[PDB]
């Protein structure tokens, strides 16, 4: 039910065949790992970089013996796209919205530009550009979302509107009534606002109530029930009020 892994990762069982894998160095960041009845393992979000992702994938190999792996990017930030390089190297099928891929490409370019203006050390410069994440191989139109069927078992990817980021999506598992809300679930404080649409956040979070969720999993920290959505709306609304948005 709970294991300590190398690289300060943990894996915690939350339901039959469903685990949350967490990086304790990176503010208790959450990755969902769910095994379908047909042997498919679905991974939602990612660790920030290659060593974390490879550790995760090795744990999946040893404990889940997947017939196939499908990874779904929640948004363009590193906790979302940081695993794509390693997922792909392992032959996993990586998915995101079109907008997520677009913003990841834009962000890489912005960074390459800044690296050009800044770095005098040529050895270092190559190492940072080399550290860039890649987008997913497979893409869906953000607003229509995507429904996977794994031998009749459904996994729904859905855009409730912009919140933590312009492209943030959630993943719902209707059989187990499990919602991975990721970084748009913020029960106490909103965190990083650089890419956020705080004005839209209350409405976007309200849309998550359309899911009959028994468990809601956030991008960081403990999960909970449907009340995780309620708490997020109050948090977002407080921020809208404070910031006059």
Q: Would you tell me which residues interact with Zn ion (CB under 5 A)?
A: 77, 183
Write down the least CB distance from residue 15 to Zn ion, Å.
25
> Nearer to Zn ion by C-beta: 41 or 239?
239
Pick 66 or 82: Cβ nearer Zn ion:
82
* Shortest spacing between CB 109 and Zn ion, in angstroms: 19
Which residue has the CB atom at the shortest distance from Zn ion? 77
State the burial class of residue 212 (Cβ atoms within 10 Å of its Cβ: 0-12, 13-18, 19+). Answer: exposed
**Shortest separation between residue 196's beta carbon and Zn ion, angstroms:** 9
Cα(55)–Cα(116) distance, rounded to whole angstroms?
32
On whether the CB atoms of residues 121 and 97 are closer than 8 A, the answer is: no
- Least Å distance, CB 167 to Zn ion, is 10
User: What is d(CA 200, CA 240) in angstroms, rounded to the nearest whole number?
Assistant: 9
Classify residue 208 by its DSSP letter. G
**Token code pair at residue 132:** 């860039």
Closest contact distance (angstroms) between CB of 191 and Zn ion is: 8
**Strand stretches in the chain, DSSP E:** 2-4, 9-15, 18-23, 29-35, 40-44, 68-72, 93-97, 138-140, 146-150, 153-158, 170-173, 178-182, 215-218
Shorter beta-carbon distance to Zn ion: residue 6 or 194: 194
To Zn ion, the closest distance from the beta carbon of 75 in angstroms equals 5
Nearer Cβ to Zn ion, position 154 or 193?
A: 193
Q: What span, in angstroms and rounded, lies between the C-alpha atoms of 130 and 123? A: 11
Nearer to Zn ion, 35 or 186 (CB): 186
Rounded-to-integer distance, Cα 46 and Cα 85, Å:
11
Q: Which is nearer to Zn ion, 202 or 219 (CB)?
A: 219
Taking the complex as a whole, the smallest distance from the CB of residue 180 to Zn ion amounts, in Å, to 14
**CA gap 151, 135 in Å, rounded:** 27
Closer of 7 and 27 to Zn ion (Cβ) = 27
Q: Is 46 left (phi over 0), alpha (psi -120 to 50) or beta?
A: beta
């Amino acid at each position: 039910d709970h294991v300590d892994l190398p690289y300060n990762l943990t894996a915690t069982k939350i339901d039959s065949d469903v685990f949350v894998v967490t990086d304790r160095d990176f503010y208790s960041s959450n990755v969902l790992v769910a095994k379908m009845l047909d042997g498919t393992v679905v991974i939602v979000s990612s660790p920030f970089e290659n060593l974390g992702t490879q550790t995760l994938m090795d744990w999946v190999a040893k404990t889940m013996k997947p017939k196939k792996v499908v990874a779904i990017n929640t948004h363009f930030h590193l906790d979302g796209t940081g695993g794509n390089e390693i997922y792909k190297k392992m032959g996993a099928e990586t998915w995101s919205s079109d907008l997520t891929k677009q913003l990841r490409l834009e962000e890489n370019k912005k960074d390459r530009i800044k690296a050009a203006e800044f770095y005098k050390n040529e050895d270092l410069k190559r190492r940072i550009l080399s550290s860039h994440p890649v987008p997913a191989d497979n893409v869906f139109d953000l607003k229509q979302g995507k429904v996977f069927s794994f031998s009749n078992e459904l996994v729904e990817v859905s855009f409730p509107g912009p919140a933590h980021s312009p492209d943030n999506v959630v993943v719902y598992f209707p059989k187990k009534k499990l919602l991975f809300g990721g970084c748009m679930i913020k029960p106490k404080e909103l965190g990083y606002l650089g890419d956020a649409n705080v004005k839209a956040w209350p409405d976007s979070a309200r849309r998550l109530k359309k899911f009959d969720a028994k468990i809601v999993i956030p991008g960081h920290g403990e999960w909970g029930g449907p009340e995780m959505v309620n708490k997020t709306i109050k948090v977002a609304e407080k921020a809208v009020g404070e910031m006059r948005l």
